[PDB]
Write a protein that binds this DNA or RNA. Sequence first.
RNA 1: AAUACGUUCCCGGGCCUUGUACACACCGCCCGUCACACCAUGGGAGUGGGUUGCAAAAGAAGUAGGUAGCUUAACCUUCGG
Length: 114
Amino acid sequence: SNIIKQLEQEQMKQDVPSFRPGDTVEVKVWVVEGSKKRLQAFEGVVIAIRNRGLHSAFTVRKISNGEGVERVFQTHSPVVDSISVKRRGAVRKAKLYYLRERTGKAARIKERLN
RNA sequence: AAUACGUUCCCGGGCCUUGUACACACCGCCCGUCACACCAUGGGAGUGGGUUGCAAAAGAAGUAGGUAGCUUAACCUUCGG
Ligand SMILES: [Mg+2]
Ligand SMILES: [Mg+2]
């Protein structure tokens, strides 16, 4: 516990920016592209956050080619290179699972602006 | 030797006439089922395409309308905007 807490926080990123459910987020991820290693962008809406120290995670949801793609990131993974908020969204819930039944015009999210 | 009134009836034939779908001409012509082969076609549980009405759903780009957020060399500035 202390031992574990101590093992876990020496592995934790220090500069995770603040973001919240409904925000539009761009995550830059390290990938091996054939024989290259590059950053690849993945942009979408944060529909779920799991706050849990080192095991923190978050689910980003986007539309590719008419169909939805959801990516669960482990926030502290070295695979995740950076996170940046592209727009601040206004929602009430913590978990936006209802957006999965919505498409295009129905799935929009107002801007927070404050 | 017998017998013949007579021509209604049988058979062959002649002339006039009539009907005919016959003309290798009534031993003529021709009809439908049935059997076999071929052709095209209708119906047929269905199978696969084209086009189309109605009722809704969808909403890329563009253009126009609105505009709190962000941003801005030329004009105004009392230099803050
Ligand atoms: Mg006679
Ligand atoms: Mg037929």
